[PDB]
Amino acid sequence: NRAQKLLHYLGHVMVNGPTTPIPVKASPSPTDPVVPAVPIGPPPAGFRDILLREGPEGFARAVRNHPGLLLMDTTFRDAHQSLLATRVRTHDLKKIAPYVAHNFSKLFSMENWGGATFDVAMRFLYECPWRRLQELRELIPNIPFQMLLRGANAVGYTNYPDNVVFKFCEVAKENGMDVFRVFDSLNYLPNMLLGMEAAGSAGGVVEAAISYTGDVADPSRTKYSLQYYMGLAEELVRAGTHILCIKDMAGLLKPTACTMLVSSLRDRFPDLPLHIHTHDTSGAGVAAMLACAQAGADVVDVAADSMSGMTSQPSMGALVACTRGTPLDTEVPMERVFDYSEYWEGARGLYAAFDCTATMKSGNSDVYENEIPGGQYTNLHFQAHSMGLGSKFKEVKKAYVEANQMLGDLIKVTPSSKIVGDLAQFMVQNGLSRAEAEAQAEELSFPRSVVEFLQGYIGVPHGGFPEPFRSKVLKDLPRVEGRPGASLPPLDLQALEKELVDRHGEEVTPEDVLSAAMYPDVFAHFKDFTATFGPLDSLNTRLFLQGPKIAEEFEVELERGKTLHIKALAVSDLNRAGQRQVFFELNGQLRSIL
Amino acid sequence: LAEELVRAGTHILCIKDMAGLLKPTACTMLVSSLRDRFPDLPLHIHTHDTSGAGVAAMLACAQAGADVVDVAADSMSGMTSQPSMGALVACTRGTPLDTEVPMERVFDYSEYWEGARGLYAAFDCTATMKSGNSDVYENEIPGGQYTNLHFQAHSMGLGSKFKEVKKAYVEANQMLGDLIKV
Amino acid sequence: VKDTQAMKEMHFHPKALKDVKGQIGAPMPGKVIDIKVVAGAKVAKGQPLCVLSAMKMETVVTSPMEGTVRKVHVTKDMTLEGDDLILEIE
Numbered sequence: 097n098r099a100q101k102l103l104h105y106l107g108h109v110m111v112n113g114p115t116t117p118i119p120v121k122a123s124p125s126p127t128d129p130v131v132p133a134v135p136i137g138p139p140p141a142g143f144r145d146i147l148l149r150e151g152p153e154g155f156a157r158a159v160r161n162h163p164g165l166l167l168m169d170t171t172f173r174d175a176h177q178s179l180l181a182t183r184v185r186t187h188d189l190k191k192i193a194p195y196v197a198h199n200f201s202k203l204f205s206m207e208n209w210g211g212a213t214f215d216v217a218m219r220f221l222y223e224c225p226w227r228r229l230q231e232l233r234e235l236i237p238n239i240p241f242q243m244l245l246r247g248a249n250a251v252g253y254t255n256y257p258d259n260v261v262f263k264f265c266e267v268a269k270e271n272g273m274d275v276f277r278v279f280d281s282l283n284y285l286p287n288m289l290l291g292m293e294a295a296g297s298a299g300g301v302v303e304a305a306i307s308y309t310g311d312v313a314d315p316s317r318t319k320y321s322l323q324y325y326m327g328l329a330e331e332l333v334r335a336g337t338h339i340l341c342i343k344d345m346a347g348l349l350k351p352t353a354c355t356m357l358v359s360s361l362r363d364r365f366p367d368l369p370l371h372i373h374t375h376d377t378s379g380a381g382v383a384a385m386l387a388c389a390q391a392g393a394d395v396v397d398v399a400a401d402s403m404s405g406m407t408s409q410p411s412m413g414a415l416v417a418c419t420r421g422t423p424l425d426t427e428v429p430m431e432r433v434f435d436y437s438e439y440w441e442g443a444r445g446l447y448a449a450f451d452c453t454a455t456m457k458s459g460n461s462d463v464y465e466n467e468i469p470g471g472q473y474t475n476l477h478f479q480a481h482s483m484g485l486g487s488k489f490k491e492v493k494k495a496y497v498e499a500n501q502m503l504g505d506l507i508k509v510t511p512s513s514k515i516v517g518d519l520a521q522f523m524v525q526n527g528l529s530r531a532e533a534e535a536q537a538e539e540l541s542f543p544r545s546v547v548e549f550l551q552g553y554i555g556v557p558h559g560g561f562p563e564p565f566r567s568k569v570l571k572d573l574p575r576v577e578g579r580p581g582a583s584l585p586p587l588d589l590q591a592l593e594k595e596l597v598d599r600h601g602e603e604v605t606p607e608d609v610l611s612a613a614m615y616p617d618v619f620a621h622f623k624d625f626t627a628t629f630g631p632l633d634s635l636n637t638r639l640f641l642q643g644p645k646i647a648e649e650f651e652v653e654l655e656r657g658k659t660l661h662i663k664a665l666a667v668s669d670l671n672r673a674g675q676r677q678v679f680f681e682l683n684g685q686l687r688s689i690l
Numbered sequence: 691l692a693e694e695l696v697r698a699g700t701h702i703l704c705i706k707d708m709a710g711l712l713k714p715t716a717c718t719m720l721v722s723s724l725r726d727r728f729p730d731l732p733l734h735i736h737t738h739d740t741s742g743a744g745v746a747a748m749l750a751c752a753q754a755g756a757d758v759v760d761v762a763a764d765s766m767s768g769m770t771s772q773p774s775m776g777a778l779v780a781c782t783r784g785t786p787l788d789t790e791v792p793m794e795r796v797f798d799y800s801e802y803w804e805g806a807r808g809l810y811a812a813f814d815c816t817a818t819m820k821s822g823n824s825d826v827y828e829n830e831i832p833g834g835q836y837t838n839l840h841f842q843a844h845s846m847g848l849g850s851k852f853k854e855v856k857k858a859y860v861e862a863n864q865m866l867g868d869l870i871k872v
Numbered sequence: 873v874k875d876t877q878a879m880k881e882m883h884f885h886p887k888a889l890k891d892v893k894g895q896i897g898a899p900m901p902g903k904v905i906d907i908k909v910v911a912g913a914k915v916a917k918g919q920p921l922c923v924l925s926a927m928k929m930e931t932v933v934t935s936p937m938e939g940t941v942r943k944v945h946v947t948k949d950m951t952l953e954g955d956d957l958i959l960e961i962e
């Protein structure tokens with residue numbers, strides 16, 4: 097009945113339209129990206145074999161001792177939200193996997209998943225993230241993976257019980273996951289320690305990143321000076337890690353800030369390899385990255401050529417070409433880079449319905465005032481469009497700075513910009529100003545997420561937050577003090593299995609149990625929709641994306657040996673009750689669908 | 691060539707790069723070399739942010755010996771345009787070079803162009819240039835012609851095979867030999 | 873010539889005036905999750921009575937003043953736009 101469900105789904109697409117909200121009304125171009133020819137032999141040996149033969153420490157000093165520079169390709173998680181709306185299907189994604197496995201072995205580790213990827217693959221993308229990792233394990237048995245997790249609340253946007261985090265982390269490492277990334281929205285050390293010990297308990301490389309905010313070279317900047325970074329770094333290194341990293345979403349790392357920070361950090365840790373993560377939003381990310389590489393850099397995050405710049409990471413080509421006659425010696429051929437960029441340039445036009453460069457269109461200087469995360473700009477644009485503030489997109493972000501000033505200058509990355517994003521959206525939706533919103537902050541109803549932030553469920557900020565505002569908003573509400581997770585009542589997920597089985601579960605795996613316990617309602621949405629319309633993420637991205645016309649013969653490989661050729665022969669009209677009929681041709685069979 | 695030019699008699703000397711092929715090493719070596727026997731004559735550099743790292747090379751040239759620098763407005767920068775105002779103004783804050791120009795005013799000057807560029811919807815980089823392309827080393831295509839070249843090719847009707855037109859350019863160059871095209 | 877085939881479109885949607893404080897408006901557009909107050913019931917200062925849901929947003933309505941409600945313009949599960957008449961408190 098699977099083929100019938102697929103035909104029903106395609107007909108519903110053709111007559112009704114795509115279910116997912118389309119930000120920009122554009123038709124994907126019928127240009128098939130070229131799949132590069134790959135070698136027949138097995139993938140080469142990178143650094144996965146070294147870690148498999150050794151412990152985490154072996155991989156650590158293997159990274160540390162190596163003469164050269166290590167490349168963090170981010171053309172699979174970063175680039176999505178940096179350019180698109182993290183709105184890429186997996187079907188075309190498994191079209192360079194043999195090529196990445198075979199040609200690319202000098203690559204350090206790959207950024208496979210993300211919390212955003214999980215949310216989109218549970219809400220809009222009708223796929224299963226555990227599967228997304230599962231089929232990708234066997235296509236590249238060469239390179240370790242890297243996945244972005246955080247300390248207190250693993251995958252959701254609010255804190256979660258410790259045992260729950262323990263079970264996600266263990267199961268994820270079990271699936272074949274390689275490297276764990278952990279951070280926290282604030283500088284809250286207990287959250288970082290919880291994430292570190294979770295990553296160790298799973299067993300593997302534990303890499304520590306810390307957010308960089310403000311100018312560390314400006315004498316005026318006093319809240320976040322060099323010493324505040326240094327003390328926090330000392331705390332983190334005594335906590336226990338393998339690789340030390342820096343988080344820079346806005347990409348505010350000047351060349352001077354680059355050199356001073358790198359020299360200061362390496363000054364007393366010439367043992368830990370260093371990881372750098374940044375976005376080329378200012379337009380001068382490449383020179384700063386070059387200076388960082390010169391000084392002490394060890395791992396450098398670099399984007400693919402055709403999804404680079406703008407709000408993304410620096411491209412492969414510039415970094416490779418500049419580091420030619422230097423001892424740094426990236427030593428990576430660029431001819432392969434050309435074809436990889438050509439494939440992505442072809443594939444990017446497939447997703448044109450949601451493209452920030454329609455609004456973005458340029459380098460966008462003047463971000464030091466905005467200080468908007470690179471991975472959140474397009475998401476805010478989309479949500480403003482959905483609420484209906486897309487026309488006043490510039491005005492919405494004009495209100496981001498004032499909200500930041502309302503709750504003060506604090507580090508903002510994942511659950512730390514979206515709340516301020518809600519603040520700015522409220523600011524423009526009620527079309528009001530800052531000072532009086534502060535004045536009449538008692539009666540004026542405020543978004544619930546802001547209230548939860550003031551409650552302190554996320555944690556305590558490094559610099560605090562104003563007292564009159566929290567008093568006028570929190571008012572008479574009970575307040576959680578310290579680390580809420582420690583006092584948080586741990587929840588049990590065994591009854592989740594039984595409830596799922598007795599409601600709609602017949603072969604639910606523990607990973608599905610985890611996904612449901614994480615995001616239950618949307619998990620029910622996924623599962624009960626995929627039950628009716630059949631198994632998705634088996635057809636071409638473009639074919640579903642347009643699916644606009646009849647007398648088009650297209651084959652869907654739901655199973656191997658089942659071509660499922662589909663020819664939309666004709667489409668009928670309304671018979672009696674607003675129900676139409678469509679003509680399909682199977683591989684050899686006619687079907688009349690209603 | 692430079693010594694012949696200086697023996698002829700000029701006032702300022704300029705270095706032109708359509709494709710933007712001044713690597714930072716080539717930047718510093720060339721600029722220092724020219725400054726070696728003429729720490730008196732004015733020097734000019736004009737390049738195009740075609741590859742994508744033109745800001746780094748421009749910074750290196752400025753540090754070594756550069757005198758005058760060509761930089762475009764932020765909204766008319768990148769892609770295949772010239773380096774942006776924002777990068778050069780921002781990086782030279784705690785730097786002895788000290789551009790020292792109000793960056794707030796450059797912001798509004800850039801915003802004007804960001805708004806105004808939308809009128810010429812017919813004339814743009816468009817889908818051929820979603821992202822800044824490398825392989826400009828392999829192409830040797832001047833950045834000043836790419837737009838006119840595409841307009842002309844579409845005018846004949848080669849916009850569809852615009853891709854093959856440009857990968858024929860390098861064979862054309864070697865068939866006539868490696869000569870400078872401006 | 874004044875055209876008689878205009879067929880002016882009727883839309884209801886009770887707009888909440890800003891001058892009147894008793895009238896209640898929606899901070900955001902969206903759909904009502906639930907209502908906590910039935911008509912002819914008593915409301916308190918700083919007490920929640922309605923909850924709004926969006927694509928990825930949730931808002932809970934906080935009572936403006938003290939008194940009793942007269943009618944609930946919104947019943948349940950409807951598409952609400954911002955700053956429209958939903959309840960009045962007296």
Ligand SMILES: *C(=O)CCCC[C@@H]1SC[C@@H]2NC(=O)N[C@@H]21
Pocket residue numbers: 177212215216469471472475476509510511513514928
């Ligand atoms: C919902 O549609 C998906 C999440 C959109 C928000 C994403 S998540 C990761 C980035 N960080 C942020 O604040 N917004 C972006």
Ligand SMILES: *C(=O)CCCC[C@@H]1SC[C@@H]2NC(=O)N[C@@H]21
Pocket residue numbers: 832834835838872
């Ligand atoms: C005709 O369409 C206008 C003149 C075309 C030549 C121009 S000159 C400046 C650009 N650089 C180049 O090589 N061609 C373009």
